[PDB]
Enzyme design. Structure first.
Site, PDB file in Angstrom:
ATOM      1  N   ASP A   1      -5.655  18.527 -50.366  1.00 28.45           N
ATOM      2  CA  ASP A   1      -5.740  17.524 -51.441  1.00 28.45           C
ATOM      3  C   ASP A   1      -6.804  17.815 -52.670  1.00 28.45           C
ATOM      4  O   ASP A   1      -7.780  17.091 -52.766  1.00 28.45           O
ATOM      5  CB  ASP A   1      -6.378  16.285 -50.697  1.00 28.45           C
TER       6      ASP A   1
ATOM      7  N   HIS B   1      -8.478  12.595 -53.157  1.00 26.39           N
ATOM      8  CA  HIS B   1      -8.023  11.109 -52.798  1.00 26.39           C
ATOM      9  C   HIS B   1      -8.914  10.756 -51.410  1.00 26.39           C
ATOM     10  O   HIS B   1      -8.573   9.318 -51.049  1.00 26.39           O
ATOM     11  CB  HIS B   1      -6.540  11.105 -52.410  1.00 26.39           C
TER      12      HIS B   1
ATOM     13  N   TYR C   1      -9.921  17.988 -61.597  1.00 24.51           N
ATOM     14  CA  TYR C   1      -9.177  17.409 -60.559  1.00 24.51           C
ATOM     15  C   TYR C   1      -9.411  18.092 -59.456  1.00 24.51           C
ATOM     16  O   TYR C   1      -8.461  18.632 -58.552  1.00 24.51           O
ATOM     17  CB  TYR C   1      -7.594  17.268 -60.892  1.00 24.51           C
TER      18      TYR C   1
ATOM     19  N   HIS D   1      -4.405   2.611 -62.682  1.00 24.58           N
ATOM     20  CA  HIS D   1      -4.739   3.882 -62.125  1.00 24.58           C
ATOM     21  C   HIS D   1      -4.158   4.802 -62.852  1.00 24.58           C
ATOM     22  O   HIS D   1      -4.995   5.895 -63.290  1.00 24.58           O
ATOM     23  CB  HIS D   1      -4.344   3.718 -60.529  1.00 24.58           C
ATOM     24  N   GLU D   2      -2.807   5.052 -63.005  1.00 23.31           N
ATOM     25  CA  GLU D   2      -2.554   6.028 -63.967  1.00 23.31           C
ATOM     26  C   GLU D   2      -2.667   6.254 -65.258  1.00 23.31           C
ATOM     27  O   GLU D   2      -3.187   7.277 -65.742  1.00 23.31           O
ATOM     28  CB  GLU D   2      -0.783   6.145 -63.806  1.00 23.31           C
TER      29      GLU D   2
ATOM     30  N   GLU E   1     -10.711  10.366 -59.478  1.00 25.60           N
ATOM     31  CA  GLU E   1      -9.923   9.464 -58.619  1.00 25.60           C
ATOM     32  C   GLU E   1     -10.377   8.181 -58.282  1.00 25.60           C
ATOM     33  O   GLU E   1      -9.827   7.076 -58.646  1.00 25.60           O
ATOM     34  CB  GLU E   1      -9.670  10.116 -57.226  1.00 25.60           C
TER      35      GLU E   1
ATOM     36  N   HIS F   1      -6.223   7.598 -65.632  1.00 21.99           N
ATOM     37  CA  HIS F   1      -6.401   9.059 -65.509  1.00 21.99           C
ATOM     38  C   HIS F   1      -6.167   9.684 -66.790  1.00 21.99           C
ATOM     39  O   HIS F   1      -6.707  10.706 -67.321  1.00 21.99           O
ATOM     40  CB  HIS F   1      -5.098   9.693 -64.771  1.00 21.99           C
TER      41      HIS F   1
HETATM   42  O1  NX6 Z   1      -2.728  12.970 -57.295  1.00 25.03           O
HETATM   43  C1  NX6 Z   1      -1.708  12.972 -58.363  1.00 25.03           C
HETATM   44  O2  NX6 Z   1      -1.843  13.825 -59.434  1.00 25.03           O
HETATM   45  C2  NX6 Z   1      -0.969  11.688 -58.392  1.00 25.03           C
HETATM   46  C3  NX6 Z   1      -1.382  10.417 -57.574  1.00 25.03           C
HETATM   47  N1  NX6 Z   1      -0.386   9.335 -57.407  1.00 25.03           N
HETATM   48  C4  NX6 Z   1      -0.421   8.629 -56.278  1.00 25.03           C
HETATM   49  O3  NX6 Z   1      -1.180   8.725 -55.640  1.00 25.03           O
HETATM   50  O4  NX6 Z   1       0.664   7.748 -56.338  1.00 25.03           O
HETATM   51  C5  NX6 Z   1       0.545   6.544 -55.271  1.00 25.03           C
HETATM   52  C6  NX6 Z   1      -0.333   5.652 -55.899  1.00 25.03           C
HETATM   53  C7  NX6 Z   1      -0.928   6.021 -57.026  1.00 25.03           C
HETATM   54  C8  NX6 Z   1      -1.858   5.044 -57.495  1.00 25.03           C
HETATM   55  C9  NX6 Z   1      -2.210   3.998 -56.698  1.00 25.03           C
HETATM   56  C10 NX6 Z   1      -1.464   3.496 -55.364  1.00 25.03           C
HETATM   57  C11 NX6 Z   1      -0.579   4.722 -55.143  1.00 25.03           C
HETATM   58  C12 NX6 Z   1      -2.608   9.771 -58.391  1.00 25.03           C
HETATM   59  O5  NX6 Z   1      -2.377   9.111 -59.460  1.00 25.03           O
HETATM   60  O6  NX6 Z   1      -3.613  10.262 -57.813  1.00 25.03           O
HETATM   61 ZN    ZN Z   2      -5.087   9.280 -59.203  1.00 21.53          ZN
END
Ligand code: NX6
Ligand code: ZN
Ligand code: CA
Ligand code: CA
Ligand code: CA
Ligand code: CA
EC number: 3.4.24.27
Length: 316
Positions: A226, A231, A157, A142-143, A166, A146
């Site tokens: 948010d 999200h 975003y 997921h990261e 997302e 991004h």
């Molecule tokens: O919003 C942001 O910038 C950071 C946010 N981080 C986040 O939600 O961390 C927990 C998580 C991430 C992926 C899957 C499950 C839990 C995001 O990446 O969307």
């Molecule tokens: Zn994310």
């Protein structure tokens, strides 16, 4: 650092044993030279200054509980790199084999992971809501996704472009999980969320409403929390992606599934060829239809299924 490529062994967050690519130069470092310009994993030492120090280990064995999040961040970054290379012919997140960097043990009791524009960052969680976040391959993927999105479509975003941003991360997070064949599912974060409670997860793609997220455009969040619900409204796209792959009947609209591989191909093409920083849901629909058309022809089942799925979630 410059040194000799070797292979170490350690234990991840969930207690599973795995081999990891390290580099030897007096110490053994979490530096994987076998993938692009390298994968580098850092110790942030419970602080918020980044990246911290390149992870150094005396004996190339990583079995200390302090080691576990580093093991998984390093290993799962490797798997995610392999996915993009092998399935989509993409070299790292920038397409030019950029070095992939992660820091673990960020802050204290930090229930979050993120891409900060330059690297990935993982908290250890508070032990209640989350255990160390790199323990989940769908989290890591997921990261990293991004970063892929940032270098390609560049989706802002915020509001609907942020929700698409997302969902892309959730979708490829899941596809990578299936690729590694590690108990794969259509849920997000199940491996690291609420260690006290079995069977739950942070979000669900198969049924977003299970955890309070919309599964239909008419139910979208229009407020300002948010970043305009990035999200939250991602649930709408996640459900559409689920339907394209798996099929089903949703609000009376029936969708024939075309499977995971084609779902990945269609969305990757949309991401890299047709989406722009300000694309909204309706433009995503158009991009996805066009991508499937490019790949399978305008009268294909694939195009038909993409249309039915977006109809099903109320995106015209
Ligand atoms: O919003 C942001 O910038 C950071 C946010 N981080 C986040 O939600 O961390 C927990 C998580 C991430 C992926 C899957 C499950 C839990 C995001 O990446 O969307
Ligand atoms: Zn994310
Ligand atoms: Ca050691
Ligand atoms: Ca899973
Ligand atoms: Ca999952
Ligand atoms: Ca749980």
């Amino acid at each position: 650092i410059t040194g000799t490529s070797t292979v170490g062994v350690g234990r991840g967050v969930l207690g599973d044993q795995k081999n990891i690519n390290t580099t030897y130069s007096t110490y053994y470092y979490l530096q994987d030279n076998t993938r692009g310009n390298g994968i580098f994993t850092y110790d942030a030492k419970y602080r918020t200054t980044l990246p911290g120090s390149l992870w150094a280990d005396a004996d190339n064995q990583f079995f200390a509980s302090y080691d576990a999040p580093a093991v998984d961040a390093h290993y799962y970054a490797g798997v995610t790199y392999d996915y993009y290379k092998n399935v989509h012919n993409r070299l790292s997140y920038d397409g030019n084999n950029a070095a992939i960097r992660s820091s673990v043990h960020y802050s204290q009791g930090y229930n979050n992971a993120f891409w900060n524009g330059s690297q990935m960052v993982y908290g250890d969680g508070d032990g209640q809501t989350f255990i160390p976040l790199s323990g989940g391959i769908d989290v890591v993927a997921h990261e990293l996704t991004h970063a892929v999105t940032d270098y390609t479509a560049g989706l802002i975003y915020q509001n609907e472009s942020g929700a698409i941003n997302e969902a892309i991360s959730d979708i490829f997070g899941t596809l990578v999980e299936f690729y590694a064949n590690k108990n794969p599912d259509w849920e997000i974060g199940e491996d690291v969320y609420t260690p006290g409670i079995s069977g739950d997860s942070l979000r669900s793609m198969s049924d977003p409403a299970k955890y309070g997220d919309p599964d239909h455009y008419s139910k979208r969040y229009t407020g300002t929390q948010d970043n305009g619900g990035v999200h939250i409204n991602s649930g709408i796209i996640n459900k559409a992606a689920y339907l394209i792959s798996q099929g089903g009947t949703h609000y009376g609209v029936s969708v024939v599934g075309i499977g995971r591989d084609k779902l990945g191909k269609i969305f990757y093409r949309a991401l890299t060829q047709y989406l722009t920083p300000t694309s909204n849901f309706s433009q995503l629909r158009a991009a996805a239809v066009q991508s499937a058309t490019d790949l399978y022809g305008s009268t294909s089942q694939e195009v038909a299924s993409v249309k039915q799925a977006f109809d099903a979630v109320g995106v015209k």
